[PDB]
Amino acid sequence: MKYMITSKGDEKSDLLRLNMIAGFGEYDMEYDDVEPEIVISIGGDGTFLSAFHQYEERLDEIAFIGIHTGHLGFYADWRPAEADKLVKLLAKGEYQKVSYPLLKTTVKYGEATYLALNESTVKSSGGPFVVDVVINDIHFERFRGDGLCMSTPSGTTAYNKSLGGALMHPSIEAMQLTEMASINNRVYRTIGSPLVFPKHHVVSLQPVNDKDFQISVDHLSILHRDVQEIRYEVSAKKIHFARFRSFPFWRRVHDSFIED
Amino acid sequence: MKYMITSKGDEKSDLLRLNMIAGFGEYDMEYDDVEPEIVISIGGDGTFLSAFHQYEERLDEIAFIGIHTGHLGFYADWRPAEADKLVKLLAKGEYQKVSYPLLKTTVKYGEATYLALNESTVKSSGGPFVVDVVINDIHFERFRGDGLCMSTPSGTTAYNKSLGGALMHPSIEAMQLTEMASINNRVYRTIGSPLVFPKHHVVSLQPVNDKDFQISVDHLSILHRDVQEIRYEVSAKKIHFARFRSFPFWRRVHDSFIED
Amino acid sequence: MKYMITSKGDEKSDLLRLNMIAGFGEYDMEYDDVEPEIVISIGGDGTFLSAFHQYEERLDEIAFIGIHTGHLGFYADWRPAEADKLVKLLAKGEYQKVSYPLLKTTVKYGEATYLALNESTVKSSGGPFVVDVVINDIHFERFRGDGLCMSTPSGTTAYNKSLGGALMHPSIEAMQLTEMASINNRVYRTIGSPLVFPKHHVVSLQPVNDKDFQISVDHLSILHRDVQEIRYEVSAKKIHFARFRSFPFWRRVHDSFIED
Amino acid sequence: MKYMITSKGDEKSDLLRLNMIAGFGEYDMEYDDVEPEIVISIGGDGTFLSAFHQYEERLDEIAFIGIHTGHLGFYADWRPAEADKLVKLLAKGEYQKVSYPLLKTTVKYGEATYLALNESTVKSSGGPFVVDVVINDIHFERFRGDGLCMSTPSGTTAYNKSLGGALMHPSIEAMQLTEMASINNRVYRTIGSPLVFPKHHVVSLQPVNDKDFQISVDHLSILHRDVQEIRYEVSAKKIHFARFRSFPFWRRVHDSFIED
Numbered sequence A, B, C, D: 001m002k003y004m005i006t007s008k009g010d011e012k013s014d015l016l017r018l019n020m021i022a023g024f025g026e027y028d029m030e031y032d033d034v035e036p037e038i039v040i041s042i043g044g045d046g047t048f049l050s051a052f053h054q055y056e057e058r059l060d061e062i063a064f065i066g067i068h069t070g071h072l073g074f075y076a077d078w079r080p081a082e083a084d085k086l087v088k089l090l091a092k093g094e095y096q097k098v099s100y101p102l103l104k105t106t107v108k109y110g111e112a113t114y115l116a117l118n119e120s121t122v123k124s125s126g127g128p129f130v131v132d133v134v135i136n137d138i139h140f141e142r143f144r145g146d147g148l149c150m151s152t153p154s155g156t157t158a159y160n161k162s163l164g165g166a167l168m169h170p171s172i173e174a175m176q177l178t179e180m181a182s183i184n185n186r187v188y189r190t191i192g193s194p195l196v197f198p199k200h201h202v203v204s205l206q207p208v209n210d211k212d213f214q215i216s217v218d219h220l221s222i223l224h225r226d227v228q229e230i231r232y233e234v235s236a237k238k239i240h241f242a243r244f245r246s247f248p249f250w251r252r253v254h255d256s257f258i259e260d
Ligand SMILES: [N-]=[N+]=NCCCCn1cnc2c(N)ncnc21
Pocket: A045, A046, A074, A075, A118, A154, A155, A156, A157, A158, A218, A219
């Protein structure tokens, strides 16, 4: 059973990484960042996202685990001083795997798929943002504002939360769309409410004038030219976590936003 | 196969009801409001809610169908002039049944269960509303404001929508909690975001000073004294609709809030 | 120069009141709760509101001052341990007076005026809340929801803030109206945005079906039957504070909601 | 008394412009786009903003007037078919001038002032947006989100409205700040409520890491590097409108967002 460990690169996370590799050396555990089976993130949630995207082609073969050196994270939910007990149970242990749903983002020109852990956003490159929203091949609305954000269940606690979106429990295979500063007068009308779509529903964005958009998936932001369709749906692929303890999602929400 | 038809009582809905009973008389269809198998609502969504609560003890044995004489409703989605084609297919037809999730509300003193189609709300009888929120036996927050609203998937388009809640597709077995004018300063903290809970999750409300609350289930509002716990969870019971046509939930949302 | 002191009634505020009366006795300062010139509140903001409404017929003749025994308040902005220095400067001192705007609320039947320090709210007695909104004799909208709240500048930090309202600086003679869980579909339309009205603007509420409303002014809540019009405007009367120090309104907002 | 007329450039507005110049030729009215006294905008609100910024150095010497060829605008509030009656009263008439407040935006490096009619916004060039907010030389908060928007009274109906801001009547000399998708957890805290500042209050933005910002004034968007301070305050300069009729601001709000 192979493993690898990424670090935030600062003074604290690098020294915590070298002490776990030394601890993992007392066990016959091979370090392999090429085709690992246990990926360990040390730092914050952004480090976990980078660690996730580094191996998004082997999601079935990998069980993730995150350690937080700064604040408490939603994916990095392991205190740094608890690493020695983590190394012990992650070696000689069987534990159990927990899986979360993911978001597929398809872009067509005149196809490019993506996998997101938190959210995927769309904005305009310069001019005003105007798109028609199609839900299962039915025109629902014509949005105009700053943009739109489609979130995963676990990602509702991120950017989705800042846009008024609802926090969904990760056991629900769904995706949530939220609006960014839309225009609503007697002429232009958007729904306003966040929308939650189940598995096997397809939300499609279609341009109306400008065909250049600034699509961002998680932290990765990029620019697309002459875009024909942006296609959202819940991915069949799932991330796999490795849990040694009961840390409820609703408890992580509490400690992060209420008090801890 | 028995049937019954409730009416809004006005001049328009009563005459539409008598023309369907006459149409149903050409077929060997017995009218029975005691133990029917097909309940028909004529009027609005409020008439459908009353028709629902009139037979919430025979939900498996009943397939509902609603006709709207005023506006377009979410449960009453059949144009009045389409009643003759409805009577024809509802008699000699097999159609297909569609089921939505429901909400169970338990109240304990020193137990009383309820079934809601839209939402269940809690407020205080006079004084300020203060409750502790417990999620699966874990204290999540101490709310203080006007009250709280727990919504069903199909009920997100009602009161839940007015509170900033997200609109969920009815195929998702879940419930959504939304806040009513909460207080948030450096001392008192609520989450603010609407919360979506899956099946088999229990949200419990517990008093902090006053033990009298104005609990309302759908339209039925009542007052409870010396309350110990308000217990929410997704009911195992489901309502059964009878669909003769493709009318997507997202299309009903469009026609009701965008344009029609 | 006469004075009086009200108390929250608890063990802490009553003992703090008797130590100031003893301190005020070393000076030739007459205690008079009939026609005072300096009203002192000890406890919280609710105690200050009661102290305000106890003498709302002598607002020009009174300069208010509040002490907070619990949390920090917006009107009770004096630490309890700073009472001896307060008694000293309030006796032999000239200080300076600060004035805030107030809200006039007129109710007509088939007239009853009120003065509010924070806000005045309107709801329905049982049935749905439906009112037409008239602004300077021009029909602006037909509201339907839970109710409406009209706030004073200093009251924007209270109930107005919980309804999404903006926080106005008290030096602005204005009033702010905010909506309570309104209904908005393709048929019924409200503005949604909080509205800020200047001096000499009249916002009038007019019933549409039910003519019974639960009008509340600050903490005082009451019920009115067969109501014809609810009339809002900025009062010409102003409350008078007595400031010995620089405590900016924006600083009080910071300490109350950010950190202190 | 000189005059000039700008056009949207389309087929409809250009032909409406040439018919007014011909009408203004029957009167001894000199056309002068260098130093006019009456500026006329034909098209939309964006055309009025460009017409405003074309002469923001002669605001006292100019009384503006806008005609709308597309929708109804807030600054272009004159029906196209009413141009002949406009030309008549604008020539031989005295009318009356109406003045609105404006927003001053100062940027310092290691000064550049601006005048806005609607709003001024700040965002980050790439990285996360983090700024400290200083109000009259007092640190109020440390914002982190997408950005911030400071609005004028008449501009509250634009971008400010899309951010949850309140609509202020133009007779109030003030400015309103609204937040753009801020982050709020147990660590990072923003006020959330829109803030309304009176005349002679200074809101200052100060960077925390990145010193490059995408400042936008009305429609004009630009990029600033190595920024030290962004300084907001209500300008002493005021725009001057020329009104021939009673068109209340609250009525323009009604026709634009409710119905017309
Ligand atoms: N991109 N970036 N950097 C900002 C990272 C902010 C914290 N954060 C990242 N993911 C999150 C998540 N799923 N739930 C809650 N909080 C999260």
